[PDB]
Amino acid sequence: VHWLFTTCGASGPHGPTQAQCNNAYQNSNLSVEVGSEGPLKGIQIWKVPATDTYSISGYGAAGGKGGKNTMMRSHGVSVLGIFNLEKDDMLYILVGQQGEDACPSTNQLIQKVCIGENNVIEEEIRVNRSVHEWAGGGGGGGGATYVFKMKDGVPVPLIIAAGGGGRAYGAKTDTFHPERLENNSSVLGLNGNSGAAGGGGGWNDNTSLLWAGKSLQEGATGGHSCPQAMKKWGWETRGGFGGGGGGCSSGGGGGGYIGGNAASNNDPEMDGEDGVSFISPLGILYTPALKVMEGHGEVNIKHYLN
Hints:
The protein has 306 residues and is mostly beta strands. The protein has one domain. It contains four helices and twelve strands; from the N terminus they run E-H-E-E-E-E-E-H-H-E-E-E-H-E-E-E. A seven-stranded mixed sheet has the order 2-3-6-7-8-10-9, with no helix packed on it. The chain is elongated. Belongs to the protein kinase superfamily. Tyr protein kinase family. Insulin receptor subfamily. It is found in: Cell membrane.
């Protein structure tokens, strides 16, 4: 007996509708309520059937790829906890969505960049030393996966499994930074830093920049693409639902409890950072967090024996 929560077929910066999850879950014994407006839009609400110890395995989404798809993407993080839950408790489950890949594109000039038939960016890096005009090509951050409850009206996080940062346009490494896992509620769950690309959204912040991933309590919408990339040629690479940041040349930050930082400038080699994961101090971590998801996130819940 288990319950498997998916994106219900949704992708991109916005989460699924009620009808998408109803369709996705028609063959299983899983019923959820999905809000249609406000900060809870796209978050799946599930009723705990019995008082028991449960395992809640959360899996964040991967970040997007950069200016070539011949690079590894930053995989989303797994966080596996056990929790005491009471019958009829309501769990709020946001399944993170993959950060958008920069390529391929519908635009003629951006596709030529994608297959290496347009060297404007390389030329700008050569003649000039930075990318100020031909911005774009970095991937969006992946959304984190959030599992939380309500306590006297205030949201309380249980599991947050971080999203991967987007790859920069010019990324050429297959290595990543270690997983950060927080478990102290006193540590503020803030957005990551935004620069040209968007920082990842955290758990609870105030987001003003269109390209920044929104924090969970703001509704966790993935960030828009960076303004210069839109202004120059419409290169739209967005973050995934769950707080992913938009991509510029640099990659967007992954969502999390604390969002991943994007580079302060538009460095075409600077990946977005992965977000920071979280486990409630009242849960128990079953095994170390690992980066494992190449696409969208997911949540698996079951009765926990032992």
